[PDB]
Amino acid sequence: QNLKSTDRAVQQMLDKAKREGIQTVWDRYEAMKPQCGFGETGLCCRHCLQGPCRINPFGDEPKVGICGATAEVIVARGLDRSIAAGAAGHSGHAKHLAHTLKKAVQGKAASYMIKDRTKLHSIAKRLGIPTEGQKDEDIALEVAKAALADFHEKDTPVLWVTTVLPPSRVKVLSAHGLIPAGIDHEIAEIMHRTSMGCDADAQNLLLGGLRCSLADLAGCYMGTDLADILFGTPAPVVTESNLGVLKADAVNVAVHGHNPVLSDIIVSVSKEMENEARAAGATGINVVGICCTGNEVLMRHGIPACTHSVSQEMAMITGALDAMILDYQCIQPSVATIAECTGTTVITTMEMSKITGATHVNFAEEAAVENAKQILRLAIDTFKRRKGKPVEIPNIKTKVVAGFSTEAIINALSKLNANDPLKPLIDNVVNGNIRGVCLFAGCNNVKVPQDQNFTTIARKLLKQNVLVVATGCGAGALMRHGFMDPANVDELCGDGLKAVLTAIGEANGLGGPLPPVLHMGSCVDNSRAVALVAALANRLGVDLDRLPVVASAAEAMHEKAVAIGTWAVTIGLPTHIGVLPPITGSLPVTQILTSSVKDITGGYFIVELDPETAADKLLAAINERRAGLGLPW
Amino acid sequence: QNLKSTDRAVQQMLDKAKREGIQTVWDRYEAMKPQCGFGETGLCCRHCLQGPCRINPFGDEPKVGICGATAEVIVARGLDRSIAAGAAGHSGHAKHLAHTLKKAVQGKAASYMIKDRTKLHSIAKRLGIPTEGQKDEDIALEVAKAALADFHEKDTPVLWVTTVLPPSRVKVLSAHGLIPAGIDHEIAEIMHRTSMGCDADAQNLLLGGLRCSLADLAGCYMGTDLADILFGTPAPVVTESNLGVLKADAVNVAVHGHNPVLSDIIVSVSKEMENEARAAGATGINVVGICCTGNEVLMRHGIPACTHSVSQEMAMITGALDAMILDYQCIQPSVATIAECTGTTVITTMEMSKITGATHVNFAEEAAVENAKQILRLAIDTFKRRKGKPVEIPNIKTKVVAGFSTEAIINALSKLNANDPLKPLIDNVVNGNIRGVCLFAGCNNVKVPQDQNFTTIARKLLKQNVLVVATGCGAGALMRHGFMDPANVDELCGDGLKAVLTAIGEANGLGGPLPPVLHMGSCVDNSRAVALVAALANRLGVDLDRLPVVASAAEAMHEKAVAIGTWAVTIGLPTHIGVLPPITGSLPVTQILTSSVKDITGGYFIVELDPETAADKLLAAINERRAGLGLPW
Numbered sequence A, B: 001q002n003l004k005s006t007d008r009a010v011q012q013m014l015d016k017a018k019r020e021g022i023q024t025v026w027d028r029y030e031a032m033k034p035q036c037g038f039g040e041t042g043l044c045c046r047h048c049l050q051g052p053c054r055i056n057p058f059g060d061e062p063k064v065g066i067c068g069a070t071a072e073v074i075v076a077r078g079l080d081r082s083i084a085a086g087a088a089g090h091s092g093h094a095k096h097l098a099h100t101l102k103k104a105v106q107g108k109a110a111s112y113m114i115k116d117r118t119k120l121h122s123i124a125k126r127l128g129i130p131t132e133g134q135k136d137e138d139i140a141l142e143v144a145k146a147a148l149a150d151f152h153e154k155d156t157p158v159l160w161v162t163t164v165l166p167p168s169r170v171k172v173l174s175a176h177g178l179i180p181a182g183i184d185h186e187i188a189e190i191m192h193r194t195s196m197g198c199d200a201d202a203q204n205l206l207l208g209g210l211r212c213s214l215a216d217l218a219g220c221y222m223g224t225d226l227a228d229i230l231f232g233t234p235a236p237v238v239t240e241s242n243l244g245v246l247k248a249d250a251v252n253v254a255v256h257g258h259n260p261v262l263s264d265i266i267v268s269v270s271k272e273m274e275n276e277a278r279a280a281g282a283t284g285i286n287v288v289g290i291c292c293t294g295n296e297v298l299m300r301h302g303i304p305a306c307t308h309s310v311s312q313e314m315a316m317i318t319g320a321l322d323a324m325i326l327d328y329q330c331i332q333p334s335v336a337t338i339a340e341c342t343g344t345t346v347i348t349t350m351e352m353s354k355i356t357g358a359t360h361v362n363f364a365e366e367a368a369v370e371n372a373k374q375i376l377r378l379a380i381d382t383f384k385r386r387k388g389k390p391v392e393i394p395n396i397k398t399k400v401v402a403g404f405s406t407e408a409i410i411n412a413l414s415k416l417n418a419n420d421p422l423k424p425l426i427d428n429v430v431n432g433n434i435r436g437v438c439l440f441a442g443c444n445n446v447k448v449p450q451d452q453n454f455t456t457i458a459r460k461l462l463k464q465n466v467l468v469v470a471t472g473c474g475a476g477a478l479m480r481h482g483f484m485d486p487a488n489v490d491e492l493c494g495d496g497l498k499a500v501l502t503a504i505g506e507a508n509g510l511g512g513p514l515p516p517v518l519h520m521g522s523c524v525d526n527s528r529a530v531a532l533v534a535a536l537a538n539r540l541g542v543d544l545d546r547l548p549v550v551a552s553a554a555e556a557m558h559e560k561a562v563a564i565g566t567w568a569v570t571i572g573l574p575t576h577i578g579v580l581p582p583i584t585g586s587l588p589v590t591q592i593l594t595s596s597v598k599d600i601t602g603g604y605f606i607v608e609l610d611p612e613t614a615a616d617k618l619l620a621a622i623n624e625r626r627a628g629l630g631l632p633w
């Protein structure tokens, strides 16, 4: 099973699924092989009913689409639609939160409130909204109005782009026409320009893609900002991860999907119901996280993470998962079928994300607590049906220190330099104790043995003194293999990095170091990494494409991950992707994305499927940035 | 060549392309066969980087997508993305016009103005904008603001849906949650819900598709409304169509694409430049139309239509097409390559729609006349380079009576009943002289011999006394085969229909009938057919799904045509599609779209590739509607 996942708890559940005849994502992948090489290379188009069109990567006809679309047009149009789809997910999430904040401060949803007043006022100031003499509720109404206004054209560009990057970066982007006019405007323009008989110039198409990726960045930053207002900015927390966080004698409830509007309410209402759960024979309600909504409640509340991404079905295979509470995105719809076998109650809550065979409980913010109780009573009832049944929870978990919002990182660093917190970090980049920074982001993918690329690359970079930060299921991969446990710093980190993590941790009273990898949150919380990197660029007086900072979507899957990698390139970072995106069927598109975009944004994709080679390429990119700043490397 | 096109002028140009070795759309189609059956049936998904996933229509594995997506989910998600793409095109067009109207009345674009003041005031009244005591420019600013507001959520739904359908239809749609909240909002929600791990219930997905199709309807109606304000509501005109409208001794300039913002300015500036063209040896500038922008200037100015859709390359093969002036959508990008062979100057004008190898002249409304002169001077220069070269313009053209906006149809009918214009039409539906109404819409498709389905179906329906109306390239097909020439009424029309067309035409002083088919305009002007049908429903006091009115996208191609067919079903019409959409790989999705949607909206798709059978099915649908109104049939 280690060819499927490097996670031992997942391997144990794969053996249970095999002997019980429960088909998994890995079995469905095997059944799909060999996969279509036209789609794998990007040389397929179904944008009109004259299709499907395909182009042989090599050889004879077909060489061109029926309408005359070349390989470079077809590849660029498909990639642009993936970016637009990713932007539609992250910004759908953000829009949901904007509507929740508005309802809250209009008195329409009393289960929600302004929890981080400080962040509300800072966002208002950043956006140019006056706070002096204003009621918090009125400021929040104006922030929610500004959030919603960024979805459409108006007399300003998207402010969750132009106010969150330094002016010199905005200027570079504006000079190339890359600043989005409106988030949903750009998504629709992509769908228009990529439809039949429209845009048919690869560079033009890909510039539109870069712009739409910044609409995705705006949605991510907006979702982090609004979720911090509503639910609190994360601070360092200690918890655990992997399937051993399930407890046979508790009602085990996973929150899965993306939006904390849902998750966060499940967490508080579940403790409210301890006594009812005990009344049912359970010790209590054990809320656990899957995917980004799990990361949201891990970061804010220390809720333990059960699993992530490709292995999500394995939580159900234990037999102990009484409920899986879903909102949207990244939920394998197989979970509704598996539930018939495992007893789990799978519950959808959002009207635009239903799964045939799952129970639907409409969630309304206006009725959030009651809707939550309804949902948790189904969970308790499911716990009751499994009294007497043995379960197989692998007794495998790791310790996880997390909660490293950008505010938390700056506060930690301020213990070493109170009035210039970023300076101790920059000092150690300059003296070589920190070689650079790498952000691990994005998914697992069934094509890659689960977590192998994240852990292989992260081990090489940590030994070379790279400060590693992580989000989403990249953070999930690293947490489940111990990279968020400070007890593993000696094993994993180079001496320079160890010295810095230890100095910061001691100054923070820890009696030891920060963990090897800093968990910066969910995938929208890649925006926190942008805030940190923009702050470092501003403090140094250089643009982002001069910093020794890189990103790696080492096992990417979702259209959202393609959008994140594309905005990482657009804001100026060397950006590794460890699965093949469907671009290899066009050399000119590949050359743009891996080379000539350097002359546009200064960032660039590094496509590399072999993780040791990827680590070497990421180190070379870091070291090239060091050299360009005149630093030793 | 008649297996490729039923148009004799196209056949002649196909012989010229063959002996000159110029590859055409039909050759690229042959080179693509056999096409992929997974894509043809809809059983392919590339929504994440675990893909491509496919499902065998029959047999053994693969049976399910890697994430667990079933065939019905994959088929429904692909269809929903096509609807969203279509909505993105028509509403991109509409948004462009809204911005042009705003610029015009703010003094920012003096080449544009309020030409149809009457329509401006009626649209304002329909939208609820006050006109009394207001400056036309202020009313127009408020209409343009309302147009732009319909792209995003606000305190009202999309008004270019709810104000253009009768209240009883709005109520039906609202009861099913189908009224769009914002045009670009719905497009983005589709892209979100269809991304990996999101919506996975076929009925839920398809309800979202129906709602997004009404966003496309709103974009079409908004684009017709705004283009009528700016450029005038069409009234009946007489012109010609097919390649014989090109003139060897003139500078031949085709306007191609969709938006009249461009086309309409080319038309007036070209007459301004007669003397310059004569100075170059030409008799003048001969502007001709291709595709919908050609339909826009045909309807408003009587500009002759050269060709449409699948045969658009053939205009260039004549050797006489000096320039092809493009905006966006439905332009085969092959035209940029063919131009190297034919001498034509292909000029793009919109920054989101470029074609490698074509000259780009940025068009700005603020500089429209100067930009137009620049463009037409390239055309004159191209004419000069071909002095001495023989050309081969087929001497084949038809007479075309067109210009039948809904206002023009009502005015024509008012000559028979001044204060109740729709009553003479309804009287003749009741007495059986008019069996029903059929709208032909949408594209040609290289899979169908060009125009064969439109003309075969239209001949059967006209003999059975159906009033036939047409738009877009359906109108193009029928015009090029003589269906818009009143001299062909005796040949084509049943005695009842002939009597009505003659009575209306005589009352209009024509000394003869209206033409066999009424041209209602471009594809956004399918909204004119909606206005007529909604007016008839309102006058009868019944909803649209009780009228004997059907639609046929007999040779559909573009995602826009899929969106139009889907909103035709959503507003209550039986809607034929004469090519296979990628739904046959899911019986449950097919059953929804062809049968159970009748219980939701009262409309339904009729998929039928054989045109004689399609005509029989369309007549049965009309006659079932007649029977339900208690009428003989």
Ligand code: SF4
Pocket: A045, A046, A047, A048, A049, A050, A051, A052, A053, A065, A066, A067, A068, A069, A074, A195, A196, A197
């Ligand atoms: S848009 Fe062009 S390449 Fe794509 S399916 Fe249609 S004809 Fe083929």
Ligand code: SF4
Pocket: B045, B046, B047, B048, B049, B050, B051, B052, B053, B065, B066, B067, B068, B069, B074, B195, B196, B197
């Ligand atoms: S979304 Fe599901 S069906 Fe589609 S490519 Fe990804 S794994 Fe395959």
Ligand code: FES
Pocket: A036, A037, A038, A039, A040, A044, A045, A052, A054, B036, B039, B044, B046, B052
């Ligand atoms: S031919 Fe396989 S993805 Fe289209």
Ligand code: FES
Pocket: A036, A039, A044, A046, A052, B036, B037, B038, B039, B040, B044, B045, B052, B054
């Ligand atoms: S397998 Fe051919 S369209 Fe994907």
